Amino acid sequence: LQSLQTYVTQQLIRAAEIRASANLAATKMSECVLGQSKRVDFCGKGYHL
Amino acid sequence: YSNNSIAIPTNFTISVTTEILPVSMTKTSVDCTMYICGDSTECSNLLLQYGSFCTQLNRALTGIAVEQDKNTQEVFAQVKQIYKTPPIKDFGGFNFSQ
Amino acid sequence: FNGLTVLPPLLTDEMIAQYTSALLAGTITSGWTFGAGAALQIPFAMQMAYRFNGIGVTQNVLYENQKLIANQFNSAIGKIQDSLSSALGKLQDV
Amino acid sequence: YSNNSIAIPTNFTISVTTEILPVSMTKTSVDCTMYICGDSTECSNLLLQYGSFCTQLNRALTGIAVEQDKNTQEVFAQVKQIYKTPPIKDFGGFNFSQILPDPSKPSKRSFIEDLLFNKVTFNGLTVLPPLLTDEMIAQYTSALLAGTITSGWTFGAGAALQIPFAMQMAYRFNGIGVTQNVLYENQKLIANQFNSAIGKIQDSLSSALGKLQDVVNQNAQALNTLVKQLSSNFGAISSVLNDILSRLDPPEAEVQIDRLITGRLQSLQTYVTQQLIRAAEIRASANLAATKMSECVLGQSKRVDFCGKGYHLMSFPQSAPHGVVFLHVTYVPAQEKNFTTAPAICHDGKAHFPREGVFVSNGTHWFVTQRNFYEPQIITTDNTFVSGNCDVVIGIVNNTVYDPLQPELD
Amino acid sequence: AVLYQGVNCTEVPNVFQTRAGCLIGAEHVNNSYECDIPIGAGICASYQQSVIAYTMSLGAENSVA
Ligand SMILES: *[C@@H]1O[C@H](CO[C@@H]2O[C@@H](C)[C@@H](O)[C@@H](O)[C@@H]2O)[C@@H](O[C@@H]2O[C@H](CO)[C@@H](O)[C@H](O)[C@H]2NC(C)=O)[C@H](O)[C@H]1NC(C)=O
Ligand SMILES: *[C@@H]1O[C@H](CO)[C@@H](O[C@@H]2O[C@H](CO)[C@@H](O)[C@H](O)[C@H]2NC(C)=O)[C@H](O)[C@H]1NC(C)=O
Ligand SMILES: *[C@@H]1O[C@H](CO)[C@@H](O[C@@H]2O[C@H](CO)[C@@H](O)[C@H](O)[C@H]2NC(C)=O)[C@H](O)[C@H]1NC(C)=O
Ligand SMILES: *[C@@H]1O[C@H](CO)[C@@H](O[C@@H]2O[C@H](CO)[C@@H](O)[C@H](O)[C@H]2NC(C)=O)[C@H](O)[C@H]1NC(C)=O
Ligand SMILES: *[C@@H]1O[C@H](CO)[C@@H](O)[C@H](O)[C@H]1NC(C)=O
Ligand SMILES: *[C@@H]1O[C@H](CO)[C@@H](O)[C@H](O)[C@H]1NC(C)=O
Ligand SMILES: *[C@@H]1O[C@H](CO)[C@@H](O)[C@H](O)[C@H]1NC(C)=O
Ligand SMILES: *[C@@H]1O[C@H](CO)[C@@H](O)[C@H](O)[C@H]1NC(C)=O
Ligand SMILES: *[C@@H]1O[C@H](CO)[C@@H](O)[C@H](O)[C@H]1NC(C)=O
Ligand SMILES: *[C@@H]1O[C@H](CO)[C@@H](O)[C@H](O)[C@H]1NC(C)=O
């Protein structure tokens, strides 16, 4: 039972990290692909096209 | 640096860069009674006295599992319709075949 | 075999590929207008001239150097393709 | 798609959308000695040997509790002063009565706020009251909204500066790339569209708040599991300490009291850990809400799909139980038409390019228009600039460019 | 000052009753200022002499012309 609890806890923490990464990816899809971004180094180095 | 000197570029370069981003992870589920006890009924009766420990574990794992699908849908599903490219491909000199 | 199961995801890989192709075709045919509303067609060179206006350079700079820019873009895509087939550590760590 | 075909919209639509965001969660505290032991002194002495387990739990819960108040203050408290709306309400034809406060309603909440509030519904466990009462949050929201409709975006940067509402909306159309005369010529149509959109939002709500309800359900479920966990034996003869204390002498009672202590302590630790993880998630959501308040409400956003679908114009905040609601107004093009287009025009051995426009043809004549609206105009040297000769450009066309000065000289 | 959280002032061994609980040792004042030390439900505490309790003020009030 202790082993199972340890496993589930670390899975919850990893899932939170992956959720943050997925939110970043969705924002990049909206702002870099559907539009043209004036934010510096968000989409890439240089001037985004 | 000088107080009356400037530098102006006279040409340009087009650069393409790649970025990698994880979106989702694998979806797994665990059955407490099978993992802890197997097919033993004595072990099951002994396990019942630590009541409600497995329901919470199953709820946690199910929540993670549904969150993964929500992640993927949030990232990719952003188009109302499925647009198609014309059979004739004249985009100036740009070559998007790859 | 100890109660551990793996569940299949809702969206198969073909569906994700279809989504990606729809996004990319909409981009190259309509520009940025399909995000705001209905897609509106515009020739590709004219859209790239709009984007040069977006970064602070005039349109004639694009129209006078169109072949040079096209060649540079094609070479950059080729280099990306060669670089990959020789980088995905973030995905492998998961 | 074709290499000389373009589509230009000839009309527009004003659309209002709603967004829901959780901000904070309920604040709870748990007393370890009362939960685990109750009023038993033998249980307390046995508990002391697992030293420092409860102080950490109390510190964790207190940290979560203070973080919730910091979340709410970060989101709503962004105005220096409490601005007020004038008694005379002439904002062109725009009607903000639904979102504005009315004294008759409780807590002086607006109509939509009242609709929003109705939709969302002894063992050492205590619930602490939040620092900011609902009336204070409503006052903050009304100050933000009145400042917006009276001064525009100037109250965020510094002191508020008054400007008539139609002029501010014309500034925002300049912000999205359309000219001012497009607003001034179609003012009544836009006002009617905005009013109808607000009406539809009001009808839609009174018939959507699942994100706010999920938080309440999760908190209640966690507390119910915590309380239900007291009934377990964990291997002892019974789950009641008062029964074990009787019927048994201390040397025999201590082992079973130990089993009960171990089980209940493990239950408390599980509860606190899941609460910490949920609090981190809520903090991320509150940070998103604060950023949206700064960038969509106090300003006008050029980021795509941040504030809403379409081209952002302005946003209005409302308060909901443990959360915030954003009403985003956006501009959507409509009723498009087909034309043929060219990159440049070759006149008199020169190339002319548009200043902030696009060349279009209705099949016989060539005009220059703005990109987001169809307002064709004649091509003159005031609309266009010259660069080089006609050889280089691919797709150049032949036309004539009217020179305004020549008729005056003749 | 001492705050007994959640109990009625009758059930205790300058007694001011707040939605947070029973506050003993602090004097209520009609004036309002910024918070300083926070108690629940819109009541704050500060020192200015004895400890005082008041309702916090959101900010200054003005009307745009
Ligand atoms: C193409 O347009 C020209 C010009 O019409 C002007 O621009 C239009 C976009 C619209 O705003 C009109 O109201 C403008 O007058 C058309 O030429 C005109 O045609 C009308 C009708 O026959 C005639 O009375 C005018 O004298 C014409 N103007 C000139 C300068 O000759 C033309 O007919 C349009 N072509 C097609 C195929 O529709
Ligand atoms: C700007 O840079 C480009 C890229 O190097 C130059 O184009 C190259 O010119 C040389 C010499 O004429 C050729 O050998 C290359 O093949 C060209 N490359 C491409 C991709 O066309 C261009 O000459 C530079 N501009 C100026 C004014 O020097
Ligand atoms: C642009 O769209 C608006 C909105 O539909 C049109 O206004 C409508 O016009 C019809 C016909 O005249 C009326 O029956 C509706 O009552 C109008 N609606 C509103 C809200 O005023 C407008 O006519 C369109 N513009 C053009 C040039 O067709
Ligand atoms: C635009 O006008 C120019 C000049 O009037 C045209 O250029 C001529 O094209 C013909 C086509 O064979 C040549 O024979 C001439 O030598 C060119 N120059 C002149 C001065 O006539 C050009 O063709 C026109 N463009 C279009 C699309 O008709
Ligand atoms: C585009 O690239 C592919 C692959 O390098 C090549 O075969 C093709 O000739 C190029 N041009 C066109 C018009 O497809
Ligand atoms: C604004 O809307 C309200 C509610 O629909 C309506 O009663 C009122 O007449 C409208 N106009 C003004 C000027 O308040
Ligand atoms: C433009 O013409 C094409 C011709 O096939 C048609 O399919 C398209 O719908 C037209 N565009 C508009 C906006 O009517
Ligand atoms: C457009 O494509 C046609 C072939 O379909 C070609 O004849 C014409 O020159 C092209 N126009 C431009 C501006 O490249
Ligand atoms: C305290 O008790 C009195 C009567 O004993 C009652 O009137 C009052 O409402 C009580 N206060 C609270 C907060 O319950
Ligand atoms: C505070 O307000 C109450 C209620 O009106 C009043 O009875 C009391 O005299 C006031 N105290 C002071 C110091 O103004």
Numbering used by the authors:
A (entry chain C): 1001 to 1049
B (entry chain C): 707 to 804
C (entry chain C): 855 to 940, 944 to 951
D (entry chain B): 707 to 827, 855 to 940, 944 to 1146
E (entry chain A): 609 to 621, 641 to 675, 690 to 706
Source paper text:
Similarly, we also show that the Y453F substitution in the RBD of mink spike, a structure of which we also report here, only increases affinity for human ACE2 if residue 614 is a glycine but not if it is an aspartic acid.
Here we have examined the structures and receptor-binding properties of spikes of the B.1.1.7 variant first described in Kent, United Kingdom (now termed Alpha)10,16–19 and the B.1.351 variant first described in South Africa (now termed Beta).
